[model samples]
Target: PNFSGNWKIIRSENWEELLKVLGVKPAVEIKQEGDTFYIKTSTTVRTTEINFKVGEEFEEQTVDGRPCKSLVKWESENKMVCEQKLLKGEGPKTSWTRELTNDGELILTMTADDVVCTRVYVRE
Candidate 1:
């Protein structure tokens, strides 16, 4: 899983659509410039500014224009960890672990409090 190039998502499957299903308004679009990623989501008022590297730690603000905070950490060469924290109240910080498959796919396991979900991403 050498994610060191300029790449786009092949298909997000359940995950991408899940955002919409959760009433996120489905406007997540991302483009990379230099080393940062600019995400425009849902409405023009919704945006996320992020800078990341394959094995580096980074942060991202939540979409839906909410003020939640998310941290992404790379665990290994082909593994990553993601954590989300609510701005206020106790929404239960969730963690997602992702690993790249030899088939060029990223398998993700998301755990929140006690519940867990799985998804996959293929490289484009």
Candidate 2:
């Protein structure tokens, strides 16, 4: 999705429950250096980074306060998907997809169990 830029959340859907665990709004930045991609997320409290290559397995910190084994893959030119399987806990398998709109919007759809949350972002 050519997500190599700074972005900020604009709106969200079905995020109230997810917001309970997460802080408030979280700004995000994405960049790619060669084949590896970096995702930097920041909130009012602190900032964190996740570095991984597509189709490669890695570990990632989850929003619900746990570390999980993660793998990211490119589904299309305008979309990417990531699946995180819990390491040692009983939790739902997390699947998140990022899509870029032609209108210059970043759409993030996150699924946990039966509930799905969508957050829209724009360039910062």
Candidate 3:
């Protein structure tokens, strides 16, 4: 259940539209160092990183370059969930659940508004 590693996106569903809804361009590269996650997102509009730790609520920059109050918690040894409430622009209150699969893959299910995206990432 060690998720501290590099990962690359293998597949996604409704991810692009979800990004459009969140006002962010998504990425395929993700890295986890201990409890901190570093997500690299690039788009024609901008490129940024989404970094956060589990079980701590923090004021963090969103994928759209806006600040939000966010919290992430571990639900089990192989699963965790995150919630982000944007502080501006009437953005969607977003939540995402990440689970580590037995095959050394990670699955992320993100939900906001009516948009839902599930992305599969394989360890690299």
Candidate 4:
């Protein structure tokens, strides 16, 4: 399957604001071209590429200027579990998941230790 599609931010609830609350400056824009995703989080920029198939592992580059490894495991038809860890040093492990909202929006839940961080996305 070609996950290579155009994506844009249509509407964002408190999700983006929450990121700001967490000291994230602001995302100038969140755009995805083909399989590559580019985002500006706070004062940093990051990129990621994901595939649609289940059991597929994607690469996500965090704003911390570190390239981390990530794996997405299926939890159900509309749910997928995500985990990430850095290649250098002992980085905190983060667990997250993806779910489709009633509006068919994609909600990404990220949890580090026990604190929760979330971001929402929609197909465009």
Candidate 5:
């Protein structure tokens, strides 16, 4: 359950609909040390790196260029949850649950309003 690796998406469902609300299509490289996680998301437009410990809250700009307050907290050793509160007009809250399966796949469950998207990633 150690989430320290380079990961790339292998499969995704219902993501295009969610993209109409928010956007991000990139590979994430995660390095976990102690209780802190160093994550890098690389995209064609930009690449962002962030370091946060469990329960820490910070502000960030989404790939779609929206401002939001984000928090990453551990739900379990094999899974973690990230919640975001958007700051744009008519703000919406979002949640992303990342779970690692026994097959060593990282499943990302993204929720926004009534839309739920599931994406699977594999470590490289």
Candidate 6:
């Protein structure tokens, strides 16, 4: 599964509500550079970046600028699962499951608190 490319947002479901629950604005762009994912939300506000490989744990910050203990693991071919635990005061734990579809699209399922959102991106 070569997950390297520029993916543009096509459509989303409940993404806005999830962002509201997470206390952050929606990301305008999602880019994958090698093993690092650069999620550009706001130019000056914050750009969520996650540098990781399978079965590895690293420290990262959420899109809302909250520090989180992060871990990413591969579930299957072209499918990745990520877990983020907020290190700040009290915040909801998050889990992101991303799948690279055969049609060259990326489907991301995000869950936090009681909210679940899915965003679809097409290769650019």
Residue ranges of candidate 6 with Cα displaced over 4 Å? 24-48
Q: Candidate 2: lDDT of 55?
A: 90
Q: lDDT by residue for model 5 over 63-123, one digit each (tens)? A: 3457777888888888889888877655445777888888899888877766788988898
Say which prediction, candidate 3 or candidate 5, comes out ahead on TM-score.
5
Ten residues in sequence with the least summed lDDT for candidate 3 = 25-34
10 residues in a row with least lDDT, candidate 4 = 1-10
Candidate order by TM-score, decreasing, is 2, 5, 6, 3, 4, 1
Q: Could you tell me the TM-score of candidate 3?
A: 0.73
- What lDDT does candidate 6 reach at residue 52? 63
**Model 1 lDDT per residue over 44-105, tens place:** 46544445543444555432233455666668767767777767655434566757677766
Greater lDDT among 1 and 5 belongs to 5
lDDT of 2 by residue, 6-68 (tens): 999999887876645443389999897755889898999999998999899999865575788
lDDT of 6: 0.72
TM values, all candidates = 0.52, 0.87, 0.73, 0.55, 0.84, 0.76
Measured with C-alpha atoms, the lDDT of residue 108 in candidate 2 is 94
What's the lDDT for candidate 5? 0.80
Over 68-114, each residue of candidate 4 has an lDDT whose tens digit, in order, gives 67776767656668677766655445566756666666666666544
Clashing pairs in 3: none
Clashing residue pairs in candidate 6 are none
Sorting all predicted structures by lDDT, with the top scorer first, yields: 2, 5, 3, 6, 4, 1
Task: Note the Cα lDDT for every prediction shown.
Answer: 0.51, 0.82, 0.75, 0.52, 0.80, 0.72
Per-residue CA lDDT of model 6 for 21-105, tens digit only, reads 8888234455555466545443356554445656678887664567788888778878889888888677777788888888878
